[PDB]
């Protein structure tokens, strides 16, 4: 009687969902949130055996352990144990789309556990087992006898084992099916795994117990008073001597407390709930909760007798906060929020989708450290501990039901079918009943990518009836449907409309003012951070700050979903789509994070931190104006740190303490700054510093910064002409310039500098040539594949145009002698099938001081896709340990993603000039560089550059960063101009026009020499 193929059966004998319980038998333990004797963990070593289908599971297993089984750790994903491969598919379902049927060959994981139960647990009360997460459906047996069934991989399933357990040894048999009808609602773009991946527990409750409690906090207009309302429901024998006492604790203090017997108010003609009671406590001047200041209280619910005997007690942290959308704005405690959020999948590079406290806290610290204040549980309820952490550390959470069917056609084929209303209903209602008490949860989401069906509207209204305290949102069907309180598009651009039929993505600014529209707009996903991305990120924030109703969004996404594999030698490397024999697979589309699977920041994370600062600065002569973007806190743990520097050389500095009220401003008068003398550019740089360490930050943590170009002094005193003069030698094949020790050679057959010498030492391994292409970035490739080509993607437009295989034809190559320098003039014409794509005219001027002045002037056909770049490149022979440059840094920065970078003198090891993106591509570029120093070399001008041991060619031919091999020497890419990286989304041209090399005619000048 196949239950995994019937959307009408989502469980069998499963107990009701509810807030986190622990059944303390001591109120003091409850208040202090200390471990509970009535809550045992069944985590550890279990017995596991894999099978090709449930029909292959031998009966013996139900009562007797299979010897063929192995001992494995639980929770875990059997794919991670190597029992079968984890699949990575984006939209296209991993199985054949034929609801509600699943493959006959359904990987079945057989988990078993022998453990014993204290005799005292069976002498009284209720003993139940709790599975926080089983992917994707499963049957449970206790001591050979069958208990129940459950579906929905992201919420806990609980069963009453009281009548199955015996004192002493007991055995659990858990048959977990990888696929099930529930899989139709679990089509998220992530690795497709299975098994018991979340904690297993054993909870003992009294017979007469607390079965549920709801905490609510309502305030007066100025939040000076608040009423805490606690609705409590019980089970078991009802008796008058029964009582419930809800007490509110602020630390060791008891702010309020109320006691009352069961018996609710009259609700209808039949009376009221005799098995419930509501307590209402008053609270004067409550400490409000926010991501800024996570002020919490402790609510302790006690079930006892009138004579004072405790029966059992439950509790939870309470955060006094009011969330409401009013007059088009999302208000948190009366103030309009600006969501600096990010989407976060529960992913571990080694543990699969199994979460642990440590990984969680880590992520949370990183997030807050990079100025994030909100997170979206994309796309399913998260592990229970997570909400607890966000509560205490301070993070606005979007709790999202486990429902995605993006693979269906049309997308709402299931969500609009009343036959599936039941399955969906439970994934929404059970989430609410579980997490509704967490203050960090400020918004409820109905799921992800599932079109817009009636079911969504029905469930939308349910939440609104059940819990008025939180707004509901859903992006399906166009982001502004009748099923959402917030216009929550995903990847809708700032100024550009994407008029798709039925579900267009309007410019977020245009969206707010559409006729009739009045809701607040917060993108549920934006700034696809896939690889070298996040370009144009600053534009979003510029807009968020200017438009009251543009209240932020959630970046996509937090961490790369890469898994660790090992080569023959036993070395670890990051793997993605297909790397497990999984097929069909979606390449590297599972890696869209701001950090690598091991939580190592990507360059882009830094840009995010900067744009999401909570302190804005403006400069007016001598005064720096600091404006606070906080809504509640005062800048009581910050001090401004300034410093003036002439092209890297510091001159003055100081530090003023910050005393800014939320929303307020503070003026800082810098002392008569040092009057520069030497030629150069003076740069004022301010940094906000947190002197004291917090719960999430180290001491001296930097929360914000900003630069300003002070005065400038154009150098007029041109160089003192040296008396030496370069000598020009002429072959029929070469032009050789010699000066003292240095030797220059221009191959008259190419028109390029083929070699240089500093003594009997060669300097180049590859001629110094022009370059107009780049190792395609993920954003340049989009969804274009080997067999399926997307002619629109930048990479394809370039390929087709012939940029990647252009033959450089020589038009001219002459040499002349001047009063004090040799002058080589070149001129090339890159073409493809006749079409002249680029023309590069240059003039090299080597003078007495031994400096080579390269002047380039390029032309680009006004009918050939704009080049990825316009510069020069060559393979240097040396391999130095450091790289020093005066320009934007220290981290990788590109035209459309360089706001965070600062202008100064930077020095780093050659390796840090290379960004280890799992999928290799153009990287490590640094813009606005006036001086570059590598080995004996020094390049001067106003260029961009990237320097590493990998050629653009290798990079574009290599698929994984671990297959990259260092090459002889160091590859230098010096660009006069570089196209933006884009990133508004990674599946369609997303580079803003102002960042496209389209000028037609470009000009840059370089000065090569020996330092």
Q: Which is nearer to ligand GAL, 189 or 579 (CB)?
A: 189
CA–CA–CA angle 617, 622, 628 (5° rounding): 20
Query: Which one among 85, 91, 702, 880 touches ligand GAL, defined by CB under 6 A?
Result: 91
Q: Which is nearer to ligand GAL, 448 or 996 (CB)?
A: 448
Task: Confirm or reject binding of residue 189 to Mg ion (CB under 5 A).
Answer: yes
Task: Confirm or reject binding of residue 592 to ligand GAL (CB under 6 A).
Answer: yes
CB of 184 to Mg ion, least distance (A): 10
Contacts to its own copies by CB under 8 A: 681, 709-714, 716, 718, 809, 811-812, 814, 816, 818-819, 823, 827, 829, 836, 838-839, 857, 859, 861-863, 942, 1001, 1003, 1005
Q: Which is nearer to ligand GAL, 492 or 626 (CB)?
A: 492
Query: Which one among 249, 987, 1004, 1008 touches ligand GAL, defined by CB under 6 A?
Result: 987
Q: Which is nearer to ligand GAL, 343 or 745 (CB)?
A: 343
Residue 400 a catalytic site member: no
Q: Which is nearer to ligand GAL, 378 or 990 (CB)?
A: 378
Residue in 346, 449, 607, 796 annotated catalytic: 449
CB of 577 to Mg ion, least distance (A): 14
Phi first, then psi, for residue 507 (nearest 5°) are -60, 130
Q: Which is nearer to Na ion, 578 or 674 (CB)?
A: 578
Residue 169 a catalytic site member: no
Give the CB-side neighbour count of residue 223, counting CA atoms within 13 A.
Answer: 13
Task: Confirm or reject binding of residue 380 to ligand GAL (CB under 6 A).
Answer: no
Q: Which does 899 bind (CB under 5 to 8 A by kind): Mg ion, Na ion, ligand GAL, none?
A: Mg ion
Which residue, among 311, 309, 124, 318, has the nearest Cα to 234 in the 3D structure?
A: 311
- Cβ–Cβ < 8 Å for 111, 71: no
CA distances from 542 to 546, 551, 552, 612, 625 (A): 6, 12, 11, 10, 18
Phi first, then psi, for residue 799 (nearest 5°) are -50, -55
Question: Measured between alpha carbons, how far is 716 from 593 in angstroms, rounded to an integer?
Answer: 48
Task: Confirm or reject binding of residue 379 to ligand GAL (CB under 6 A).
Answer: yes
- β-partners of residue 559 are 595
Task: Confirm or reject binding of residue 330 to Na ion (CB under 5 A).
Answer: no
CB of 585 to Na ion, least distance (A): 13
Query: Which one among 899, 921, 929, 992 touches Mg ion, defined by CB under 5 A?
Result: 899
Query: Which one among 151, 245, 290, 378 touches ligand GAL, defined by CB under 6 A?
Result: 378
Q: Which does 411 bind (CB under 5 to 8 A by kind): ligand GAL, Na ion, Mg ion, none?
A: none
CB of 812 to its own copies, least distance (A): 6
Residue 702 CB neighbour total at 10 angstroms: 14
Question: Measured between alpha carbons, how far is 143 from 129 in angstroms, rounded to an integer?
Answer: 14
- β-partners of residue 205 are 126
Q: Which is nearer to its own copies, 675 or 805 (CB)?
A: 675
Query: Which one among 158, 186, 391, 406 touches Mg ion, defined by CB under 5 A?
Result: 406
Q: Which does 956 bind (CB under 5 to 8 A by kind): Na ion, Mg ion, its own copies, none?
A: Na ion
C-to-N gaps above 2.5 Å in the chain, after residues: none
**Backbone torsion region of residue 334, taken as left when φ is above 0, otherwise alpha when ψ lies between -120 and 50, otherwise beta:** left
Say if residue 143 is preceded by a cis peptide, omega within 30 of 0: no
**Beta strands 821-832; 807-818: pairing state:** antiparallel
What is the token pair recorded at 124?
A: 């009284």
Please count the residues of this chain forming the interface with Mg ion, following the rule CB under 5 A. 8
Angle formed by the axes of helices 603-611 and 537-546, nearest 10°: 10
Interacting span for Na ion (CB under 5 A) from 194-202, 301-309, 592-600, 730-738:
592-600
Query: Which one among 189, 391, 400, 904 touches ligand GAL, defined by CB under 6 A?
Result: 189
What is the token pair recorded at 72?
A: 């494995």
Measured from each CB, the residue nearest to ligand GAL is 189
Residue 300 CB neighbour total at 10 angstroms: 24
DSSP code per residue over 635-660? STT-EEEEEEEETTEEEEEEEEE---
Tokens 């003012």 locate to 513
Residues whose CB is less than 8 angstroms from the CB of residue 573 and which lie 6 or more positions away in sequence, other chains included: 564, 565, 566, 567, 960, 961, 962
Q: Which does 16 bind (CB under 5 to 8 A by kind): Na ion, Mg ion, its own copies, none?
A: none
- Interface characters, 555-594, with Mg ion (x: CB under 5 A): ----------------------------------------
Q: Which is nearer to its own copies, 636 or 712 (CB)?
A: 712
Task: Confirm or reject binding of residue 778 to Mg ion (CB under 5 A).
Answer: no
Question: Measured between alpha carbons, how far is 201 from 49 in angstroms, rounded to an integer?
Answer: 21
Residue 938 CB neighbour total at 10 angstroms: 17
Task: Confirm or reject binding of residue 893 to Mg ion (CB under 5 A).
Answer: no
Task: Confirm or reject binding of residue 189 to Na ion (CB under 5 A).
Answer: yes
The separation between CA 11 and the C-alpha centre of its own chain, rounded to angstroms, equals 33
Q: Which does 712 bind (CB under 5 to 8 A by kind): ligand GAL, Mg ion, its own copies, none?
A: its own copies
Residues whose CB is less than 8 angstroms from the CB of residue 863 and which lie 6 or more positions away in sequence, other chains included: none
Phi first, then psi, for residue 269 (nearest 5°) are -50, -20
Question: Measured between alpha carbons, how far is 299 from 318 in angstroms, rounded to an integer?
Answer: 6
Q: Which is nearer to its own copies, 510 or 1001 (CB)?
A: 1001
Say if residue 379 is preceded by a cis peptide, omega within 30 of 0: yes
Task: Confirm or reject binding of residue 592 to Na ion (CB under 5 A).
Answer: yes
Q: Which does 416 bind (CB under 5 to 8 A by kind): its own copies, ligand GAL, Na ion, none?
A: none
CB of 189 to ligand GAL, least distance (A): 3
CB of 191 to Mg ion, least distance (A): 13
Phi first, then psi, for residue 592 (nearest 5°) are -130, 20
Residue 107 CB neighbour total at 10 angstroms: 21
Question: Measured between alpha carbons, how far is 561 from 574 in angstroms, rounded to an integer?
Answer: 9
Q: Which of residues 599-658 bind Na ion (CB under 5 A)?
A: 638, 657
Q: Which does 550 bind (CB under 5 to 8 A by kind): its own copies, Mg ion, Na ion, none?
A: Na ion
Which residue, among 474, 490, 600, has the nearest Cα to 555 in the 3D structure?
A: 490
Q: Which of residues 391-450 bind ligand GAL (CB under 6 A)?
A: 448-449
Q: Which is nearer to its own copies, 310 or 827 (CB)?
A: 827
Task: Confirm or reject binding of residue 533 to Na ion (CB under 5 A).
Answer: no
Query: Which one among 490, 522, 595, 927 touches ligand GAL, defined by CB under 6 A?
Result: 490
Q: Which is nearer to ligand GAL, 188 or 996 (CB)?
A: 188
Please count the residues of this chain forming the interface with Na ion, following the rule CB under 5 A. 7
Q: Which is nearer to its own copies, 423 or 932 (CB)?
A: 932
Give the CB-side neighbour count of residue 953, counting CA atoms within 13 A.
Answer: 8
- Interface characters, 5-44, with Mg ion (x: CB under 5 A): -x--x-----------------------------------
Residues whose CB is less than 8 angstroms from the CB of residue 373 and which lie 6 or more positions away in sequence, other chains included: 291, 292, 339, 340, 341, 394, 395, 396
Which residue, among 849, 867, 846, has the nearest Cα to 858 in the 3D structure?
A: 867
Residue 567 CB neighbour total at 10 angstroms: 9
**Beta strands 297-305; 310-318: pairing state:** antiparallel
Which residues make up the interface to Mg ion (CB under 5 A)? 3, 6, 9, 181, 189, 406, 449, 899
- Supply the residues annotated as catalytic: 449, 525
Q: Which residues bind ligand GAL (CB under 6 A)?
A: 90-91, 188-189, 378-379, 448-449, 490, 525, 528, 589, 592, 783, 987
Contact residues toward Na ion (CB under 5 A) are: 189, 550, 589, 592, 638, 657, 956
């Amino acid at each position: 009687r196949r239950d995994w193929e019937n959307p009408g059966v989502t469980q069998l004998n499963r107990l009701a969902a509810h807030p986190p319980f622990a059944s303390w038998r001591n109120s003091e333990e409850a208040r202090t949130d200390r471990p509970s004797q009535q809550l045992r963990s069944l985590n550890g070593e279990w017995r596991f055996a894999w099978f090709p289908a449930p029909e292959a599971v031998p009966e013996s297993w139900l009562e007797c352990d299979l010897p063929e089984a192995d001992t494995v750790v639980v929770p875990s994903n059997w794919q991670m144990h190597g029992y079968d491969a984890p699949i990575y598919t984006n939209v296209t379902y991993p199985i054949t789309v034929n609801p509600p049927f699943v493959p006959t060959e359904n990987p079945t994981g057989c988990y078993s556990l022998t453990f014993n139960v204290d005799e005292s647990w069976l002498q009284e009360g209720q003993t139940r087992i709790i599975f926080d997460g089983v992917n994707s459906a499963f049957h449970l047996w206790c001591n050979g006898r069958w208990v129940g069934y459950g579906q929905d991989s992201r919420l806990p399933s609980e069963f009453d084992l009281s009548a199955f357990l015996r004192a002493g040894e007991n055995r659990l048999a858990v048959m977990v099916l990888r696929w099930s009808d529930g899989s139709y609602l679990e089509d998220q773009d992530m690795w497709r795994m299975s098994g018991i991946f979340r904690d297993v527990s054993l909870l003992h409750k009294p017979t007469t117990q607390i079965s549920d409690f709801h905490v609510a906090t309502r305030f007066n207009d100025d939040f000076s008073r608040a009423v805490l309302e606690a609705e409590v429901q019980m089970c078991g024998e009802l008796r008058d001597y029964l009582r419930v006492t809800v007490s509110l604790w602020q630390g060791e203090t008891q702010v309020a407390s109320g006691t009352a017997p069961f018996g609710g108010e009259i609700i209808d003609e039949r009376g009221g709930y005799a098995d419930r009671v509501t307590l209402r406590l008053n609270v004067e001047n409550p400490k409000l909760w926010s991501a800024e200041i996570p002020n919490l209280y402790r609510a302790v619910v006690e079930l006892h007798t009138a004579d004072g005997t405790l029966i059992e007690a439950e509790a939870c942290d309470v955060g006094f906060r009011e969330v409401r959308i009013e007059n088009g704005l999302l208000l948190l405690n009366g103030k309009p929020l600006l969501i600096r959020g990010v989407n976060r999948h529960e992913h571990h590079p080694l543990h699969g989708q199994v979460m642990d406290e440590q990984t969680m806290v880590q992520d949370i610290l990183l997030m807050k450290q990079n100025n994030f204040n909100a997170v979206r549980c994309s796309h399913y309820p998260n592990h229970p501990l997570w909400y607890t952490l966000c509560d205490r550390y301070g993070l606005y959470v979007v709790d999202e039901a486990n429902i995605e069917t993006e693979g269906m056609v049309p997308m709402n084929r299931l969500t609009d079918d009343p036959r599936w209303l039941p399955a969906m209903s439970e994934r929404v209602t059970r989430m609410v009943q579980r997490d509704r008490n967490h203050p960090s949860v400020i918004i409820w989401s109905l799921g992800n990518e599932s079109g817009h069906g009636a079911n969504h509207d029905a469930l939308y209204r349910w939440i609104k009836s059940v819990d008025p305290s939180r707004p509901v949102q859903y992006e399906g069907g166009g982001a502004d449907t009748t099923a959402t309180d917030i216009i929550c598009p995903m990847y809708a651009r700032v100024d550009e409309d994407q008029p798709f039929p039925a579900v267009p993505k309007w410019s977020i600014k245009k969206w707010l003012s559409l006729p009739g529209e009045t809701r607040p707009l917060i993108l549920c996903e934006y700034a696809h951070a896939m690889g070298n991305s996040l370009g144009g990120f600053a534009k979003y924030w510029q807009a968020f700050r200017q438009y009251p109703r543009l209240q932020g969004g959630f970046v996509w996404d937090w961490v790369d979903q890469s898994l660790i594999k090992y080569d023959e030698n036993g070395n670890p490397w990051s793997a993605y789509g297909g790397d497990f024999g999984d097929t069909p697979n979606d390449r590297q589309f599972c890696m869209n994070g701001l950090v690598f699977a091991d939580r190592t920041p990507h360059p882009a994370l830094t840009e995010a931190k900067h744009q999401q600062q909570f302190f804005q600065f403006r400069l007016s002569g001598q005064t720096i104006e600091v404006t606070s973007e906080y809504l509640f806190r005062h800048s009581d743990n910050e001090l401004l740190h300034w410093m003036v520097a002439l092209d890297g050389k510091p001159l003055a500095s100081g530090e003023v303490p910050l005393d800014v009220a939320p929303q307020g401003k503070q003026l800082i008068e810098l002392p008569e700054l040092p009057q520069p003398e030497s030629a150069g550019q003076l740069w004022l740089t301010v940094r906000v510093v947190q002197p004291n360490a917090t719960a999430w930050s180290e001491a001296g943590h930097i929360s914000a910064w900003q630069q300003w170009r002070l005065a400038e002094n154009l150098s007029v005193t041109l160089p003192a002409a040296s008396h030496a003069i370069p000598h020009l030698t002429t072959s029929e094949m070469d032009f050789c310039i010699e000066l003292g020790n240095k030797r220059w050679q221009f191959n008259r057959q190419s028109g390029f500098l083929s070699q240089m010498w500093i003594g009997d030492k060669k300097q180049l391994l590859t001629p110094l040539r022009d370059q107009f292409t780049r190792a395609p970035l993920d954003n340049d490739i989009g969804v274009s594949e080997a067999t399926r080509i997307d002619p629109n993607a930048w990479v394809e437009r370039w390929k087709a145009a012939g940029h990647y295989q252009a033959e450089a034809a020589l038009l001219q190559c002459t040499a002349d002698t001047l009063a004090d320098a040799v002058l080589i003039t070149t001129a090339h014409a890159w073409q493809h099938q006749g079409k002249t794509l680029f023309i590069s005219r240059k003039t090299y001027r080597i003078d007495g001081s031994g400096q080579m002045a390269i002047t380039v002037d390029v032309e680009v056909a006004s009918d050939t896709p704009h080049p990825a770049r316009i510069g020069l490149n060559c393979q240097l022979a040396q391999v130095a340990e450091r790289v020093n440059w005066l320009g934007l840094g220290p981290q990788e920065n590109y035209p459309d993603r360089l706001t965070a970078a600062c202008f100064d003198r930077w020095d780093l090891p050659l390796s840090d000039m290379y960004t280890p993106y799992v999928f290799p591509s153009e990287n490590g570029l640094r813009c606005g560089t006036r001086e570059l120093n590598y080995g004996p070399h020094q390049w001067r001008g106003d260029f961009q550059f990237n320097i590493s041991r990998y050629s653009q060619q290798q990079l574009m031919e290599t698929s994984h960063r671990h297959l990259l091999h260092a090459e002889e020497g160091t590859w230098l890419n010096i660009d006069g101009f570089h196209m933006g990286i884009g990133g508004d989304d990674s599946w369609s041209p997303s580079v803003s026009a102002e960042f496209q090399l389209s000028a037609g005619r470009y000009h840059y000048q370089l000065v090569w020499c020996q330092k």
